[PDB]
């Protein structure tokens, strides 16, 4: 499609304003562009939970399997909202490895 906007949106993920970073993540999500998977995977480790949530949702809409292990790791995030946005993303991607991870993450919490 229109790749022209993608580089500035990836740069907007590095902005000092977390609202700008979450906005950029939402925009890249609507595009569903695989050109932003790496940048959004990095955005999953952002200091702000509202950005991590937005990056997780955007990764789900892109549907690229490169996000599978980082999203699996985001199931053990301190912020409970990030946890179900990561789980929603994994569900959308539809990779079998997520199933085992969800049942395993249940075992680690139960102990």
């Amino acid at each position: 499609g229109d790749e022209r906007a993608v580089p500035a949106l990836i740069e907007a993920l590095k902005d000092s304003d977390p609202n700008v970073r979450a906005s950029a993540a939402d925009a890249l999500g609507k595009l569903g562009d695989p050109e932003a998977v790496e940048a959004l995977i990095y955005a999953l480790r952002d200091k702000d939970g509202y950005v991590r949530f937005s990056a997780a949702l955007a990764l789900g809409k892109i549907g690229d399997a490169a996000a599978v292990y980082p999203l699996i790791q985001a199931l053990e995030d301190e912020d409970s909202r990030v946890r179900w946005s990561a789980a929603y993303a994994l569900g959308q991607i539809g990779d079998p490895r997520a199933e085992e991870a969800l049942r395993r993450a249940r075992e680690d919490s139960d102990w």
Binding site: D2, E3, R4, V6, P7, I10, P34, E35, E38, A39, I41, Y42, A66, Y69, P70, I72, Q73, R97
Partner: protein, 188 residues
């Protein structure tokens, strides 16, 4: 199915002054998959702008031409981490054995996401030269890299992986010991 006019239009766009036109052209040519774009994309891999290099690396992997194996091995040394990621995944897709030793070095990259992509690529290639580096990667500080190394080890399979798992089951600790324990239970 292809459009020869569009392919040549995008090849010319790789020589444009605008970073954004160059990036869109490399992206478009990757989705097309025409081998006519391999030589121009190999040159775009050396572009001054990082985004243009990323799109060129992704595109060359999508085409899967072996002419790109050596330029992509060099791109594993790029200053931009997302260019190094795409160079690794592009080299995993092609499956050439020439990429095994450079990917093994890439498993020791300063960036966790590059290490993640190297583990994944070695698993897709299936070369047993990766078995020892991947076992070392089971001890990585980053949990995603550990999971990708454990997955890559299962993908390689064979007698060398089973023997390495046998040793790990006894001598190892933590996650690496668990990976080895779950491997021997699903491979006997």
């Amino acid at each position: 199915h292809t459009d020869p006019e569009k392919v040549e239009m995008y090849i010319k766009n790789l020589q444009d002054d605008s970073i954004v036109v160059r990036y869109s052209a490399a992206s478009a040519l990757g989705k097309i998959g025409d081998e006519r774009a391999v030589e121009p994309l190999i040159k775009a891999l050396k572009d001054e702008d990082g985004y243009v290099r990323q799109a060129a690396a992704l595109a060359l992997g999508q085409i899967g031409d072996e002419r790109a194996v050596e330029p992509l091995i060099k791109a594993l040394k790029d200053e931009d981490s997302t260019v190094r990621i795409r160079a690794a995944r592009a080299l995993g897709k092609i499956g050439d054995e020439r990429a095994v030793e450079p990917l093994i070095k890439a498993l020791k990259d300063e960036d966790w996401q590059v290490r993640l992509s190297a583990a994944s690529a070695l698993g897709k290639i299936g070369d047993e030269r990766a078995v020892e580096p991947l076992i070392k990667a089971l001890k990585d500080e980053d949990p995603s890299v550990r999971m990708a190394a454990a997955n890559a080890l299962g993908q390689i399979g064979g007698e060398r992986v089973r023997a390495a798992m046998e040793k790990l089951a006894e001598t190892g600790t933590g996650f690496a010991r668990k990976v080895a324990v779950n491997y021997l239970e699903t491979h006997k």
